[PDB]
Amino acid sequence: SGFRKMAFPSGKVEGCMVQVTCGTTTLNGLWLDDVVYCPRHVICTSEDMLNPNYEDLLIRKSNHNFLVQAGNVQLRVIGHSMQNCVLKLKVDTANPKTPKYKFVRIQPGQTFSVLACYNGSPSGVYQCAMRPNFTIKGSFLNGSCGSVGFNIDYDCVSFCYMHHMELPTGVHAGTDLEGNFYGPFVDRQTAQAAGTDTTITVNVLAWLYAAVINGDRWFLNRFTTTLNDFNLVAMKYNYEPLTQDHVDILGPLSAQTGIAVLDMCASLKELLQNGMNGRTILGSALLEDEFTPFDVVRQCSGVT
Amino acid sequence: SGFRKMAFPSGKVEGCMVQVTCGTTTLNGLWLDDVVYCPRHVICTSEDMLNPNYEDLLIRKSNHNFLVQAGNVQLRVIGHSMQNCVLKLKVDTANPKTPKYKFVRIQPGQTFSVLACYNGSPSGVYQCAMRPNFTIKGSFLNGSCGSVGFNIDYDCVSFCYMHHMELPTGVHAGTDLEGNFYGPFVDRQTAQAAGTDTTITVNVLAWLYAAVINGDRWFLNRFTTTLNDFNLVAMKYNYEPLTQDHVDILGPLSAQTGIAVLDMCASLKELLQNGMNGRTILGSALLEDEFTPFDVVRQCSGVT
Ligand SMILES: Cc1ccncc1NC(=O)[C@@H]1C[C@H]1CF
Ligand SMILES: Cc1ccncc1NC(=O)[C@@H]1C[C@H]1CF
């Protein structure tokens, strides 16, 4: 029993972190096989970041200009190429610590662990969700770029995020491992509008099931609702509309607890309309949306 | 910017996790140098746990009865001994992955990361605090015993906790790495009273400084208070009494922000007396006490 915002064990990712320096800029790189992946803005000076012409800036750089260091080891760069907003630095040595891995583009509402790094060194690990508006509310300071987001399935690390920037609002933006930004963001020091965000309804429902499993039951009521009625409430409270797909993914939790999905929706409806009345759910005084139904099942069963 | 409940990178601890089996019971062990540390209740059957006589139960066990497995490797046990509530299994091989480490007994109110494990395999990592009543509100299922709590200072892992049990209330109890329980708890399946808990005042104040550093300032007011006046409020709201030692540890945050400790105490006083009025602080709708002043400084500076 107990329920925590659990991150994946970061060990397999730590073994891949390196430091990449180009000119006066230093950030983090990800060393997998004989390739180091890093944000392409490593080639920019703070002056260039206002309106960078990356193709032009990269033309002035040669393999020997990219300094890649794994702790005390210096890696020899034998190739460089830009793919979208990432630089791929071919090195002459395959990382002996390369785990089994995939590059995945996650969907909004999905969760992942971030290994925050500075100068190629891991500082900490935290679990977070990709917001419906494609931002992440992370914890990143200058030098954290190149830190990655990932999920793990037994021995396989699925890399889904690489940190590139902090918006003027203090929210974070980044790319998949092919350098495609999540959201409308560009790697330029310019004001950028993040879309209207919403709360991840299916995640809140999953978290309400986790609360029941662990003993927090006060929010359960004598009511039920329909997808249509619930969605009218979800609309008013800036929650994502619930679909049959979301109901289907909640199936295992509905089955384990014996609380029908629409009955849980009616509890969520009353919580949205009345608030928590000074009470807590799993130690939170608000409705948590950073646990997916898969996260709840995994944590509640002890999956390693 | 941004502030998260960050755990230490668990890599150095993952390299130490092993599985320990004795008879029909399996749990986690910690392999450091040529010693495997695990909870002594690995020698008990669920029947023995009601009133175990550990000295007698251990006398029936021999080195060959303790099955220690590190992933696919079987370790040869050449000695066993009980120290308080831990068993120390001497093995014939030093763990090649042993990091620099210390065994420390933490104080209540201090924080640490837990690497939750099942069958010697890491499932996840989370940050938590040792409650003033010596319990931890963790996330532990059957088979999680032997999972450890730790802090890291550059390359040194300070092991401070080993998980032994879940109280009937769903809160968790465990020992330091010499097998001494934190709190009045015993390793027996019996109802056990955890003391009256309190909120860790210095941690809440540290978190209020982190909120200011990151832009959440609405709670700052035009008032100040004294240690005596604040402690009368702390008493009423089951908060730990604030001492000059706590004020001294808050010094760096008071210096960085320019908000005097007693001025922050007056903001905390108004928050305790009036609530949050439906607002949030660093994404929380309650007063967070799981970040120490050292945690706030570390996260806010990017310490690796
Ligand atoms: C200064 C900072 C802080 C935290 N995380 C990231 C950053 N850096 C940026 O925003 C880089 C300049 C842009 C490129 F899109
Ligand atoms: C069943 C469980 C669940 C989570 N964490 C731990 C446990 N196990 C226990 O409480 C063991 C029997 C006691 C020894 F003090």
XYZ file of C-alpha atoms and ligand atoms in Angstrom:
638
model
C 0.000 0.000 0.000
C 0.830 3.683 -0.451
C 0.968 5.590 -3.741
C 3.854 7.763 -4.899
C 4.860 9.821 -7.964
C 7.353 7.172 -8.933
C 9.995 7.583 -11.567
C 11.636 4.711 -13.475
C 15.075 3.654 -12.096
C 17.459 5.987 -13.999
C 20.520 3.686 -14.061
C 20.301 2.690 -17.729
C 19.967 6.352 -18.732
C 22.834 7.564 -16.473
C 25.200 5.273 -18.403
C 24.353 7.226 -21.605
C 24.833 10.804 -20.376
C 27.753 12.774 -21.768
C 28.775 16.465 -21.927
C 28.841 18.236 -25.305
C 30.727 21.532 -25.738
C 30.870 23.624 -28.874
C 32.749 26.883 -28.651
C 31.631 28.460 -25.375
C 28.313 26.526 -25.026
C 28.048 23.313 -22.957
C 25.029 21.025 -22.569
C 24.110 17.315 -22.239
C 24.294 14.643 -24.891
C 22.875 11.104 -25.076
C 25.399 8.462 -26.118
C 23.733 5.362 -27.650
C 25.835 2.937 -29.722
C 28.330 5.162 -31.675
C 26.096 8.261 -31.792
C 25.756 11.206 -29.388
C 22.413 13.053 -29.623
C 22.157 16.638 -28.357
C 20.076 19.803 -28.989
C 21.361 21.637 -32.068
C 21.415 24.952 -30.117
C 24.776 23.739 -28.609
C 26.278 25.510 -31.738
C 24.728 28.878 -30.806
C 26.097 31.696 -28.672
C 23.416 33.474 -26.495
C 23.609 36.216 -29.236
C 22.726 33.674 -32.034
C 19.687 32.381 -30.107
C 17.583 35.473 -30.934
C 17.193 34.428 -34.609
C 19.553 31.487 -35.387
C 20.212 30.233 -38.912
C 21.226 26.705 -37.841
C 22.286 25.492 -41.321
C 24.700 28.460 -41.578
C 25.915 28.131 -37.979
C 26.614 24.398 -38.421
C 28.609 24.974 -41.665
C 31.234 26.860 -39.618
C 31.601 23.810 -37.291
C 33.782 20.785 -37.884
C 33.944 17.385 -36.076
C 36.888 18.656 -33.914
C 34.794 21.609 -32.643
C 32.369 19.256 -30.804
C 33.949 18.268 -27.529
C 32.258 15.178 -26.126
C 33.192 13.951 -22.682
C 31.802 10.972 -20.740
C 32.951 11.697 -17.178
C 36.734 11.525 -17.666
C 36.705 9.927 -21.210
C 37.035 12.053 -24.308
C 35.130 10.723 -27.349
C 36.502 11.217 -30.870
C 33.905 12.776 -33.232
C 34.058 11.331 -36.762
C 30.812 12.801 -38.142
C 28.142 15.402 -37.412
C 24.670 15.904 -38.859
C 21.575 17.823 -38.051
C 18.223 16.071 -38.030
C 15.389 18.536 -37.326
C 16.484 20.237 -33.992
C 18.991 17.559 -32.859
C 22.633 17.147 -33.732
C 23.879 13.581 -34.214
C 27.603 13.256 -33.450
C 29.054 10.050 -34.795
C 31.823 8.864 -32.450
C 34.532 6.204 -33.032
C 33.470 4.173 -29.918
C 30.152 2.463 -29.192
C 28.931 3.195 -25.642
C 29.644 0.000 -23.664
C 26.728 0.988 -21.386
C 24.161 1.242 -24.224
C 20.990 -0.428 -22.976
C 18.293 -1.953 -25.247
C 16.453 1.113 -26.459
C 13.839 2.597 -28.798
C 13.069 6.197 -29.852
C 9.367 6.857 -29.359
C 7.143 9.892 -29.923
C 4.745 9.922 -26.956
C 1.185 11.259 -27.031
C 0.031 14.199 -24.889
C -1.351 12.984 -21.541
C 1.291 10.213 -21.424
C 3.902 10.211 -18.637
C 7.701 9.688 -18.430
C 10.698 10.125 -16.154
C 13.216 12.889 -16.678
C 16.853 12.547 -15.659
C 17.870 16.193 -15.066
C 21.575 16.612 -15.968
C 24.197 19.394 -15.841
C 27.603 19.127 -17.604
C 26.841 15.488 -18.499
C 26.227 14.614 -14.821
C 22.896 13.437 -13.397
C 21.436 15.663 -10.683
C 18.034 13.995 -10.166
C 15.070 12.058 -11.529
C 11.366 12.915 -11.537
C 8.162 11.675 -13.123
C 6.042 14.073 -15.178
C 3.373 14.208 -17.886
C 3.454 15.688 -21.374
C 0.693 18.329 -21.050
C -2.181 18.226 -23.588
C -0.604 21.476 -24.956
C 2.778 19.628 -25.489
C 4.705 21.463 -22.719
C 6.125 19.768 -19.609
C 6.238 21.432 -16.152
C 9.743 20.269 -15.381
C 12.618 21.427 -13.206
C 15.330 22.724 -15.517
C 18.016 25.362 -15.073
C 20.585 26.702 -17.629
C 22.851 23.818 -18.722
C 20.031 21.220 -18.391
C 19.395 21.075 -22.188
C 20.012 17.619 -23.607
C 18.495 15.971 -20.476
C 16.096 13.242 -21.658
C 12.654 11.825 -20.837
C 12.106 8.072 -21.003
C 9.970 5.037 -20.101
C 11.226 1.478 -19.420
C 9.606 -1.895 -20.367
C 11.687 -4.568 -18.481
C 15.161 -4.034 -20.095
C 14.207 -1.603 -22.920
C 14.476 2.174 -22.516
C 12.047 4.090 -24.742
C 13.479 7.602 -25.115
C 10.671 10.042 -25.737
C 11.946 13.493 -24.854
C 15.055 15.698 -25.055
C 14.972 19.053 -23.289
C 15.608 22.117 -25.458
C 14.044 25.171 -23.821
C 12.239 27.142 -21.182
C 9.404 29.343 -22.420
C 9.082 32.911 -20.987
C 6.249 31.479 -18.807
C 8.597 29.033 -17.020
C 7.162 25.924 -18.732
C 9.418 23.547 -20.701
C 9.626 22.490 -24.351
C 11.553 19.873 -26.196
C 11.761 17.321 -28.941
C 11.425 13.597 -29.639
C 14.841 11.839 -30.292
C 14.557 12.590 -34.052
C 14.584 16.333 -33.093
C 10.923 17.064 -33.825
C 9.474 19.491 -31.243
C 6.387 18.469 -29.329
C 3.966 21.340 -29.895
C 4.347 24.458 -32.031
C 7.672 25.455 -30.454
C 10.893 26.462 -32.226
C 14.453 26.564 -30.841
C 14.697 30.365 -30.805
C 14.768 32.965 -27.927
C 11.386 34.412 -28.863
C 7.991 34.677 -27.073
C 6.035 31.514 -27.928
C 2.441 30.817 -27.207
C 1.778 27.451 -25.556
C -1.785 26.303 -26.394
C -4.668 26.373 -23.876
C -3.865 23.439 -21.569
C -6.448 21.028 -20.068
C -6.429 18.474 -17.229
C -5.860 14.836 -18.356
C -9.271 13.350 -17.378
C -8.344 9.679 -17.890
C -5.273 10.139 -15.616
C -7.356 11.780 -12.873
C -9.825 8.840 -13.081
C -6.887 6.356 -12.952
C -5.580 8.192 -9.851
C -9.083 8.018 -8.284
C -8.925 4.192 -8.755
C -5.434 4.140 -7.116
C -6.920 6.136 -4.212
C -9.705 3.515 -3.730
C -7.165 0.623 -3.959
C -5.114 2.258 -1.169
C -7.995 3.158 1.183
C -8.933 6.764 0.307
C -12.668 6.217 -0.409
C -14.469 9.297 1.005
C -15.100 10.714 -2.523
C -17.169 7.682 -3.637
C -20.838 8.611 -3.917
C -24.295 7.061 -4.628
C -24.388 8.552 -8.168
C -23.607 7.652 -11.737
C -23.377 9.686 -14.980
C -23.131 9.283 -18.790
C -20.167 10.167 -21.097
C -22.298 13.053 -22.450
C -23.257 14.466 -19.047
C -19.743 14.041 -17.668
C -18.269 15.781 -20.772
C -20.502 18.823 -20.199
C -18.898 19.107 -16.670
C -15.398 18.349 -18.131
C -15.960 21.185 -20.641
C -16.849 23.701 -17.875
C -13.786 22.725 -15.810
C -11.200 22.581 -18.668
C -10.840 18.798 -18.527
C -10.167 16.665 -21.624
C -13.370 15.116 -23.062
C -13.641 11.462 -22.014
C -13.917 8.983 -24.917
C -14.789 5.243 -25.083
C -11.007 4.638 -25.688
C -10.260 6.228 -22.277
C -13.070 4.114 -20.672
C -11.501 0.970 -22.317
C -8.025 1.705 -20.897
C -9.636 2.146 -17.430
C -11.123 -1.402 -17.745
C -8.546 -3.224 -15.575
C -8.975 -0.746 -12.691
C -12.745 -0.822 -13.018
C -12.491 -4.686 -12.938
C -10.123 -4.867 -9.906
C -12.163 -2.419 -7.785
C -15.628 -3.266 -9.065
C -16.404 0.462 -9.525
C -17.830 1.050 -13.015
C -16.011 3.770 -15.039
C -19.137 5.988 -15.242
C -19.632 5.634 -11.460
C -16.020 6.880 -11.000
C -16.862 9.692 -13.502
C -19.776 10.700 -11.187
C -17.362 10.886 -8.221
C -15.040 13.061 -10.369
C -18.050 15.204 -11.379
C -18.980 15.848 -7.709
C -15.294 16.613 -6.887
C -15.142 19.154 -9.744
C -18.449 20.759 -8.735
C -17.860 20.806 -4.926
C -14.093 20.789 -4.490
C -12.316 18.661 -1.860
C -13.917 20.470 1.171
C -10.503 20.679 2.852
C -9.832 16.944 2.487
C -7.017 15.095 0.718
C -6.713 12.153 -1.708
C -3.440 10.179 -1.633
C -1.818 13.151 0.175
C -2.902 15.651 -2.491
C -5.328 18.567 -2.006
C -6.016 18.787 -5.770
C -6.950 16.330 -8.537
C -3.734 14.696 -9.793
C -3.372 14.047 -13.563
C 0.244 12.745 -13.823
C -0.540 9.024 -13.404
C -1.807 7.134 -16.467
C -3.998 3.970 -16.086
C -0.846 1.929 -16.997
C 1.162 3.725 -14.267
C -1.530 2.915 -11.689
C -1.633 -0.802 -12.685
C 2.222 -1.043 -12.668
C 2.626 0.611 -9.267
C -0.345 -1.265 -7.743
C 1.030 -4.671 -8.873
C 4.789 -4.108 -8.273
C 6.033 -4.446 -11.888
C 9.870 -4.442 -12.142
C 12.929 27.311 -13.232
C 10.297 24.824 -12.074
C 10.363 22.781 -8.865
C 9.859 19.027 -8.641
C 9.912 16.268 -5.991
C 13.227 15.062 -7.301
C 14.855 11.818 -6.342
C 18.603 11.114 -6.548
C 19.679 9.176 -9.699
C 19.280 5.526 -8.575
C 22.006 3.987 -10.784
C 24.584 3.417 -8.041
C 21.945 1.729 -5.872
C 20.554 -0.463 -8.710
C 24.013 -2.037 -9.065
C 23.748 -3.252 -5.427
C 20.287 -4.852 -5.486
C 20.076 -8.620 -5.157
C 17.341 -11.174 -4.327
C 17.547 -13.126 -1.055
C 15.497 -16.312 -0.558
C 15.336 -18.392 2.586
C 12.991 -21.343 2.545
C 9.781 -20.048 0.967
C 10.374 -16.306 1.687
C 11.963 -13.972 -0.901
C 12.908 -10.308 -0.476
C 15.600 -7.774 -1.500
C 19.177 -7.597 -0.324
C 21.852 -4.892 -0.632
C 25.207 -6.150 -1.897
C 28.117 -3.875 -0.853
C 31.691 -5.216 -1.008
C 31.436 -8.927 0.066
C 28.345 -8.493 2.272
C 24.623 -8.743 1.462
C 22.350 -6.865 3.900
C 18.678 -7.843 4.176
C 15.824 -7.734 6.743
C 16.141 -10.631 9.194
C 12.434 -11.522 8.677
C 13.557 -13.285 5.409
C 14.007 -16.350 7.773
C 10.350 -16.263 8.884
C 7.302 -17.967 7.408
C 4.068 -15.821 7.552
C 3.184 -18.103 10.564
C 6.452 -17.145 12.426
C 5.806 -13.407 11.945
C 3.104 -13.310 14.658
C 5.683 -13.718 17.474
C 9.115 -14.619 15.979
C 12.062 -15.758 18.090
C 14.730 -14.672 15.574
C 17.722 -16.148 17.464
C 15.992 -19.570 17.453
C 14.804 -19.259 13.843
C 18.307 -18.315 12.637
C 19.932 -21.292 14.461
C 18.023 -23.653 12.133
C 19.510 -21.833 9.079
C 22.876 -22.488 7.495
C 24.857 -20.510 4.846
C 23.484 -22.824 2.068
C 19.867 -21.988 3.037
C 20.303 -18.315 1.979
C 19.915 -18.119 -1.765
C 21.366 -14.869 -3.073
C 20.931 -13.972 -6.713
C 22.101 -10.847 -8.568
C 20.036 -10.965 -11.771
C 21.382 -14.197 -13.295
C 24.450 -14.614 -10.943
C 24.289 -16.852 -7.912
C 26.408 -15.665 -4.955
C 28.079 -18.178 -2.628
C 27.283 -17.486 1.065
C 30.263 -18.119 3.366
C 28.891 -16.526 6.557
C 25.688 -15.229 8.132
C 25.098 -13.036 11.173
C 22.315 -11.055 12.671
C 22.910 -7.474 13.732
C 19.791 -5.988 15.364
C 17.012 -6.572 12.690
C 19.322 -7.091 9.668
C 21.021 -10.223 8.445
C 24.544 -9.821 7.056
C 25.386 -12.526 4.500
C 29.087 -12.738 3.824
C 29.625 -13.745 0.182
C 32.815 -14.999 -1.551
C 32.702 -12.190 -4.204
C 32.924 -8.425 -3.716
C 30.256 -6.576 -5.740
C 32.124 -5.093 -8.730
C 29.438 -2.365 -8.810
C 29.970 -1.268 -5.174
C 29.938 2.526 -5.165
C 31.639 4.713 -2.503
C 29.215 4.476 0.382
C 28.465 5.223 4.040
C 25.792 3.908 6.445
C 24.058 6.855 8.086
C 21.243 7.163 10.627
C 19.147 10.115 9.423
C 17.165 12.455 11.672
C 13.369 12.800 11.472
C 12.381 15.587 9.054
C 15.302 14.667 6.754
C 14.597 13.405 3.220
C 15.897 10.544 1.012
C 15.176 8.597 -2.157
C 13.774 5.092 -2.071
C 14.483 2.551 -4.795
C 11.415 0.265 -4.584
C 12.453 -3.301 -5.542
C 10.742 -6.687 -6.027
C 12.700 -9.979 -6.368
C 15.975 -8.008 -6.459
C 14.736 -5.904 -9.410
C 14.167 -2.139 -9.304
C 10.606 -1.034 -10.049
C 10.874 2.713 -9.336
C 12.403 5.602 -7.410
C 10.751 8.300 -5.300
C 11.748 11.004 -2.848
C 10.224 11.023 0.637
C 10.765 12.301 4.179
C 11.271 10.431 7.437
C 8.209 11.653 9.397
C 8.813 13.262 12.827
C 7.182 10.048 14.215
C 9.844 7.886 12.377
C 7.444 6.365 9.793
C 7.685 6.958 6.031
C 4.627 7.248 3.730
C 6.109 5.103 1.003
C 4.806 2.901 -1.790
C 5.554 -0.692 -0.836
C 3.823 -3.963 -1.655
C 4.620 -7.536 -0.420
C 8.136 -8.488 -1.596
C 9.417 -4.870 -1.322
C 11.245 -5.515 2.007
C 14.978 -4.945 1.720
C 14.422 -1.923 -0.598
C 16.665 0.910 0.645
C 16.564 4.678 1.214
C 19.630 6.760 0.392
C 21.168 10.191 -0.276
C 24.116 10.963 -2.606
C 26.977 13.511 -2.146
C 28.804 13.592 -5.565
C 30.038 9.934 -5.798
C 29.162 8.716 -2.255
C 25.888 6.934 -1.480
C 24.770 7.371 2.137
C 22.395 4.485 2.881
C 19.955 5.527 5.561
C 16.972 3.208 5.348
C 16.027 -0.432 4.700
C 12.344 -1.289 4.412
C 11.023 -3.897 6.849
C 7.277 -3.428 7.296
C 3.878 -1.947 6.698
C 1.933 -0.976 9.812
C -1.824 -1.837 9.980
C -2.426 1.874 9.148
C -0.672 1.598 5.751
C 2.393 3.625 6.824
C 5.916 2.168 6.526
C 8.645 1.276 9.023
C 12.222 0.241 8.708
C 15.751 0.314 9.988
C 19.109 2.033 9.500
C 21.763 -0.236 7.771
C 22.916 -1.564 11.190
C 19.335 -2.949 11.625
C 18.155 -0.469 14.257
C 14.495 0.494 13.679
C 13.618 4.147 13.321
C 10.891 4.692 15.907
C 9.443 2.281 18.461
C 8.684 -0.417 15.877
C 9.538 -4.129 16.051
C 9.677 -6.685 13.214
C 6.558 -8.578 14.306
C 2.995 -8.862 12.798
C 1.390 -7.000 15.691
C -0.576 -3.708 16.004
C 1.980 -0.943 16.623
C 1.291 2.596 17.584
C 3.110 5.194 15.479
C 3.572 8.401 17.533
C 1.540 11.592 16.944
C 3.051 12.990 13.729
C 3.662 16.710 13.002
C 4.395 18.764 9.868
C 8.124 19.551 9.309
C 8.010 23.376 9.713
C 11.554 24.081 8.471
C 10.833 22.061 5.275
C 7.587 23.955 4.623
C 9.509 27.260 5.046
C 12.260 25.968 2.684
C 9.538 25.070 0.139
C 8.020 28.576 0.542
C 11.477 30.004 -0.406
C 11.602 27.657 -3.464
C 8.133 28.948 -4.423
C 9.369 32.597 -4.297
C 12.535 31.703 -6.308
C 10.324 30.175 -9.034
C 7.683 32.938 -9.220
C 4.874 31.819 -6.874
C 4.730 34.939 -4.636
C 1.012 35.520 -3.885
C 1.409 34.259 -0.265
C 3.954 36.975 0.663
C 2.384 39.522 2.998
C 3.145 42.861 4.767
C 3.623 41.115 8.156
C 6.327 39.702 10.357
C 6.289 37.541 13.525
C 8.562 36.273 16.347
C 9.717 32.656 17.038
C 7.438 32.696 20.121
C 4.343 33.973 18.309
C 4.912 31.688 15.328
C 5.367 28.669 17.675
C 1.984 29.353 19.305
C 0.419 29.043 15.760
C 2.660 25.992 14.970
C 1.392 24.371 18.198
C -2.291 24.887 17.225
C -1.715 23.449 13.732
C 0.470 20.427 14.718
C 3.642 21.867 13.192
C 7.113 21.250 14.663
C 8.295 24.140 16.894
C 10.752 26.344 14.988
C 14.174 26.735 16.657
C 17.146 29.082 15.999
C 18.910 26.007 14.428
C 16.099 25.787 11.827
C 16.353 29.597 11.225
C 20.179 29.162 10.753
C 19.753 26.402 8.136
C 17.270 28.678 6.275
C 19.999 31.402 6.103
C 21.103 30.781 2.489
C 17.512 30.971 1.183
C 16.776 34.036 3.277
C 20.018 35.581 1.825
C 19.279 34.681 -1.846
C 15.678 35.976 -1.754
C 16.132 38.821 0.708
C 13.057 37.648 2.679
C 13.923 37.432 6.389
C 13.117 34.039 8.015
C 10.576 35.581 10.442
C 8.883 37.387 7.518
C 8.539 33.973 5.776
C 7.215 32.598 9.127
C 4.494 35.329 9.024
C 3.494 34.205 5.502
C 3.332 30.596 6.803
C 1.279 31.813 9.800
C -1.300 33.497 7.507
C -1.403 30.355 5.279
C -2.073 28.157 8.339
C -4.747 30.521 9.677
C -6.512 31.253 6.329
C -5.754 28.268 4.117
C -4.825 28.600 0.425
C -8.229 30.114 -0.641
C -8.362 27.727 -3.610
C -4.903 28.721 -4.865
C -1.776 26.628 -5.427
C 1.944 26.900 -4.580
C 4.384 25.083 -6.897
C 1.433 22.993 -8.183
C 0.389 21.906 -4.682
C -2.895 22.778 -2.927
C -1.401 22.023 0.520
C 1.769 22.997 2.411
C 4.566 20.642 1.307
C 7.054 19.399 3.959
C 9.186 16.888 1.964
C 11.877 19.343 0.796
C 14.636 20.243 3.274
C 16.525 23.608 3.012
C 19.475 21.601 1.528
C 17.146 20.016 -1.076
C 15.867 23.461 -2.096
C 19.425 24.886 -2.456
C 20.599 21.790 -4.445
C 17.650 21.825 -6.848
C 17.706 25.635 -7.228
C 21.447 25.646 -8.105
C 21.639 22.462 -10.256
C 24.017 20.397 -8.062
C 25.115 17.119 -9.744
C 17.881 29.064 -19.953
C 17.206 27.722 -19.828
C 16.703 27.294 -18.605
C 16.089 26.061 -18.512
N 15.942 25.229 -19.547
C 16.421 25.630 -20.729
C 17.058 26.856 -20.927
N 17.538 27.242 -22.201
C 16.784 27.673 -23.236
O 15.609 28.014 -23.133
C 17.481 27.630 -24.582
C 17.757 28.916 -25.323
C 16.585 28.079 -25.718
C 16.590 27.204 -26.943
F 15.266 26.883 -27.262
C 3.109 -7.102 3.558
C 3.993 -5.899 3.351
C 3.619 -4.889 2.472
C 4.443 -3.796 2.296
N 5.608 -3.639 2.932
C 5.979 -4.603 3.781
C 5.217 -5.747 4.028
N 5.646 -6.735 4.945
C 5.604 -6.638 6.293
O 4.970 -5.780 6.899
C 6.479 -7.639 7.022
C 5.845 -8.687 7.903
C 6.437 -7.466 8.526
C 7.770 -7.477 9.226
F 7.857 -6.336 10.030
